[PDB]
């Protein structure tokens, strides 16, 4: 299948003096890197996080990021002074950067920037641009950022060349983690559903990887159309948690089963009878 490599930067600027930048890196829904503000170096969160980079290529790439993090912090502080007093502290800046990998040497790279939680700027082709809906005052920051040909050449290289090359290596090195199968375990429970005579049956499903799963409340062969899947919730061990609720009438509980289909079960569906 297709995998998106996502480098997520969160930068908080409380006032002229105080700031922190924290980064996490995801390949699909698996974390590959962490870079805490407190750490001089990027941390691997998998044995295979260096992908197929030599030690010298990785050291070179890390050194570039180390200079970037310091430079970025000063650049934002200077841009605030430049736009003063239009924009003031506190300021949150987020970057989402990476590449989506497609079959047959195809990929697309992205670098999106959010200011105070709104997507306002991307890197596109050879320059920074504002996106539809961004405020006009960003034209000055963009003009200043776009004067820096050295940064533009580096960003172009990272998006066009480094990202897809690095990620092709990660996919090879991490293949056995990315393709892991972990079995769901299910269990049932019930509560009042703020309706006089109505019960809410809950089917809990936990420990499954990967994410795609099917969970249905059932009377025999009849799929209970009232079934509501909650959100996919993460477990600490890089597996998933999901619950499916059914609002029933007190007494009708008898005859209901919860059925779970998952790739890990090799066709042996879980059926739990209330």
């Amino acid at each position, epitope marked *: 299948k297709n995998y998106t490599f996502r480098c997520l930067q969160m930068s908080s600027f409380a006032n002229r003096s105080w700031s922190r930048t924290d980064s996490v890196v995801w390949l699909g829904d698996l974390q590959t890197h962490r870079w805490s503000n407190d750490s001089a170096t990027i941390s691997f969160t998998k044995p295979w996080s260096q992908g197929k980079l030599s030690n010298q290529q990785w050291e070179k790439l890390q050194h570039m990021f180390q200079v970037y993090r310091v430079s970025f912090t000063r650049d934002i502080q200077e841009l605030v002074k430049m736009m003063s007093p239009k924009e003031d502290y506190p300021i949150e800046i987020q970057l989402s950067a990476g590449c989506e990998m497609y079959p047959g040497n195809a990929s697309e790279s992205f670098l999106h920037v959010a200011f105070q939680g709104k997507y306002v700027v991307r890197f596109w082709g050879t320059s920074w641009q504002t996106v539809p809906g961004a405020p006009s005052w960003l034209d000055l920051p963009i003009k*200043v950022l776009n004067a*820096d040909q*050295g940064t533009s050449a580096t960003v172009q290289m990272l998006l066009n060349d480094t990202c897809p090359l690095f990620v092709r290596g990660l996919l090879e090195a991490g293949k056995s983690d990315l393709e892991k199968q972990e079995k769901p375990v299910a269990w049932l429970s019930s509560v009042p559903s703020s309706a006089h005579g109505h019960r809410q049956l809950v089917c809990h499903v936990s420990g499954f990887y990967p994410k795609p799963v099917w969970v249905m409340w059932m009377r025999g062969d009849q799929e209970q159309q009232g079934t509501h899947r909650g959100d996919f919730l993460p477990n600490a061990d890089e597996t998933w948690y999901l619950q499916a609720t059914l609002d029933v009438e007190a007494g009708e509980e008898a005859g209901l089963a919860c059925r779970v289909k998952h790739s890990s079960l090799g066709g042996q569906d879980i059926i739990l009878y209330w």
Partner: T-cell receptor
Framework: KTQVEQSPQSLVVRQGENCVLQ??????????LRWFKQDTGKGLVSLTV?????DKTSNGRYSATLDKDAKHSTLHITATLLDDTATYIC?????????????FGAGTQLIVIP | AAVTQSPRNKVAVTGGKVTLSCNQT?????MYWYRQDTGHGLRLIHY???????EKGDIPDGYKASRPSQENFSLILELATPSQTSVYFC??????????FGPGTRLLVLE
């Protein structure tokens, strides 16, 4: 003591001799490096700016090198004239935009005996 | 892209008020004040990103900056001291890295 160091501090050459001036820096990042000539009680005249990881420039009798890996630049003056008597100043800009700070060396004093 | 400074030379007394003026007709947003002392490179005192903006540089103590217009950037020594005897350089620039330097001002503060 500082982020930009020039050597020699000063030197005396005879007209027609060549000389080499050195600039070493710790500035990070190093977007570009400029050589200024400053005549006594006058202002800053740009001789050259170097921008590439390994760079070479020329401007008449002036030539310069930059090696960003070594953080080292040389200014070569071929066939010195009386009018080369000046202070030569190395400057490193830490950005390719107005967000940059300039880091100035304290200069090399050249005297050319006519 | 020209930059002018006035005065070009000033003798002042300790405790007196001295204003160093820089004028720039390039329509540059950005202006910068430095001092040059023997044994040092130029050192940044104050800078400005536009009218009404003043920012402290590396050595702002004993100086006030004023940017009343796009054209004019002034360095004010409210209580001049002998330590402010120096050559003062103004520069201007747009979004690019190039700073265009004025010709310098020689200030001597006598006791």
């Amino acid at each position: 003591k500082t982020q930009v160091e020039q050597s020699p501090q000063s030197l005396v050459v005879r007209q027609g001799e060549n000389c080499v001036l050195q600039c070493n820096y710790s500035v990070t990042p190093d977007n570009h490096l400029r050589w200024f000539k400053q005549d006594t009680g006058k202002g800053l005249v740009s001789l050259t700016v170097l921008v590439d990881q390994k760079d070479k420039t020329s401007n008449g009798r002036y030539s310069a090198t930059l090696d960003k890996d070594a953080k080292h630049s040389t200014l070569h003056i071929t066939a010195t004239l009386l009018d080369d008597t000046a202070t030569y100043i190395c400057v490193v800009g830490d950005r390719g935009s107005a967000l940059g700070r300039l880091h100035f060396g304290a200069g090399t004093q050249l005297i050319v005996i006519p | 892209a020209a930059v002018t400074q006035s005065p070009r030379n000033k003798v002042a007394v300790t405790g007196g008020k001295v204003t160093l003026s820089c004028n720039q007709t390039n329509n540059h947003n950005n202006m910068y004040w430095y001092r040059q002392d023997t044994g040092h490179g130029l050192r940044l005192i104050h800078y400005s990103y536009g009218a009404g903006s003043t920012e402290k540089g590396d050595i702002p103590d004993g100086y006030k900056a004023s940017r009343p217009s796009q054209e004019n950037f002034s360095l004010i020594l409210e209580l001049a001291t002998p330590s402010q005897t120096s050559v003062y350089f103004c520069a201007s620039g747009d979004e690019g890295y190039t700073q265009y330097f004025g010709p310098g001002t020689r200030l001597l503060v006598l006791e």
